[PDB]
Amino acid sequence: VGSEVSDKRTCVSLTTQRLPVSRIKTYTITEGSLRAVIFITKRGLKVCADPQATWVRDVVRSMDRKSNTRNNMIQTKPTGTQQSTNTAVTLTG
Template sequence: LWLNMNIVLTAFNIYLFLPLLGGVGSQPMRKYSCVSLSTQQLNIRNLVSYEKQKVPVNAIMFITTKGIKICVSPDQKWVQSAIKKIDQKRTTRGK
């Protein structure tokens, strides 16, 4: 009985922690992904970077100066402006 319990616990632990080791193929797993989108317009001055996401929803994840991640629809006009501003800042810093 004790041996069977150890086998069950070991199998359960492997099941729980295996996904933490990596994603499918060579793609790393995201630590955070958008499942819902904010409809509120953000202050562009408070945004430092962004990531594009296609799955599970098409979204732009903005990261604020405080490290907060906010997901929005890429179809909004202000979102495209914010992306351009962030890209310009990156280009300017790189020179």
């Protein structure tokens, strides 16, 4: 009827809704216990699906092209640190 988490982050079930890539924007596939394919739509609705589906793998292939130059064709440059060394050796005598 009404309450919190009406959409959630991940999704609800696994597939069950073959959405057209045209209706999808970007996708996210995990390797962890999740190991699920997340499909994000231009509407902001993200759903998960099993990568065991060929139709999914097929759509995933396109999805890349759909969000080839939009998904995140960038990689910020974080900071690190630095290092150095010294020596000391003079002729003998």
